[PDB]
Symmetry: C3
Subunit: 101 residues, 3 copies
Amino acid sequence: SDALHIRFPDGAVIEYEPETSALTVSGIKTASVTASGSVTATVPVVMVKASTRVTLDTPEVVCTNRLITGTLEVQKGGTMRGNIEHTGGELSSNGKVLHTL
Amino acid sequence: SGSDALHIRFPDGAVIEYEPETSALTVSGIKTASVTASGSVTATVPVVMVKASTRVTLDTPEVVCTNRLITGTLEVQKGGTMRGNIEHTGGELSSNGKVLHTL
Amino acid sequence: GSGSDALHIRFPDGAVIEYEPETSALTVSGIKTASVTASGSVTATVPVVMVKASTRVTLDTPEVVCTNRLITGTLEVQKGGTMRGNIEHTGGELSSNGKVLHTL
């Protein structure tokens, strides 16, 4: 009643290891969680290793501080407030480079 | 492999189940879920799909996208930096009340 | 009842994994790490998702897609990109290669 180690016929496992306080779900194909209110995770580090794609299908994604990306595609429009510093290439608008490199 | 089974049917109508033939884990019929951890939470899977009819909030010092980020619209509140070539088309890029391609 | 109709596990490290049907709340607490490894996909369908990560959220993926609006405090684009439609900048200076493009 105080332990968790489930081993399914397809090789999937759900286990909790109290020595390292580690919860593991492995060997599954899909997971789906459907809730009517909220899903919350509170932890210093979140790591999502997704070899195809992460889709956030929502009216609004909010990042409360910094957002860092390799490349950016804004599809429809946007607003920017504050100081914005572009360097290391050329910023073009409507086919016109705004400050040649 | 093992022979364990998971199919919990709770009195509020929620279900937690694993189906090994299709290797599908399902959690249904709940109101809330939370995970609170002192170290890390990791998900390793090709596709992550979040369908959130109100909002997704990432309340963190830093969200890092290692490659491409695509959005419908963007709002930057407190500034930033852009490196590389940035190609703007299909509308007006305005700064401080002037359209920049016609300045 | 006597069947599989409940979930409440308290582990010797103080962690809890439980489902509380009175409030329909699934809770994992008191752990150090969690991981989920799947070969196909993970889906979460719920009105509100909240991730409170006091160090970082890393999305290590070819593509992150936000289907509608994305709001951020600050933005850092490292390699380049594209923008379509109207992009309205105010409340500071937009500089390119060391030149302020329009002073208010």
